[PDB]
């Protein structure tokens, strides 16, 4: 249901932003947005714990931001290990996680 934005990449050192949105039934307003780093076929990792705060042990270069319609996640100071697949989710207190489609592409600067 939730449609994650198209995959965007960038050279190391700059910033990259991925967005997440969906219908007004599961839109980003009045819901909580979570972001995850998910290497294909491996153990995932939690990045943003809610749209504006982070999980214990997350670098401050990973910031979040959510509007009244769509949510975003920015990654500054790109590094070699940033080449992975990422997924978003929407949740509340009594509901479940609704995963986004995904943004998989990430590139290195100077290869």
């Amino acid at each position: 249901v939730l449609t994650q934005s198209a995959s965007v990449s960038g050279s190391l050192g700059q910033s990259v932003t991925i967005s997440c949105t969906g219908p007004n039934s599961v839109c980003c307003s009045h819901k909580s947005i979570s972001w995850y780093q998910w290497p294909p076929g491996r153990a995932p990792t939690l990045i943003i714990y809610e749209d504006n705060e982070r999980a214990p042990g997350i670098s401050p270069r990973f910031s979040g931001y959510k509007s009244y319609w769509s949510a975003y996640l920015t990654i500054s100071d790109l590094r070699p290990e940033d080449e992975t697949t990422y997924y978003c989710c929407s949740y509340t207190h009594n509901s479940g996680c609704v995963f986004g489609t995904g943004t998989k592409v990430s590139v290195l600067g100077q290869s």
Partner: protein, 146 residues
Amino acid sequence: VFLGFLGAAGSTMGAASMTLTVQARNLLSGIVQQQSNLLRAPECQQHLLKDTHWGIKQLQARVLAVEHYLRDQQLLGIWGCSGKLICCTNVPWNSSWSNRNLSEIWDNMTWLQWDKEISNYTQIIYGLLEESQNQQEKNEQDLLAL
């Protein structure tokens, strides 16, 4: 409904902070029944305290309890928080004590494991707590020497 004395000891710090009056009461209603000496007034005069040093020994235990109360009320006093159960101070939180964020602390931790994690720096925090007031003492000092 109220969980009872020390009921929220396994609850999140926020939940126990809601029922701190419950833990506060066992400081007084253990010692109201003993100072009462109403059920003690008639039973063999004063529970035969002659040739019974357990009676004095018992009494010394009662003394330790009110003495501990006086220690906590003194600390609340010298921190300017005598009348209140929750007071905010001027001491900033040095991050070396704990690196945990607010949500992880108040909605993921209990007061027991918190007190265990910070028992190392309690004396330092108390020192800043005894010190920080001293800048209020000094502001009042400016108002005193005009």
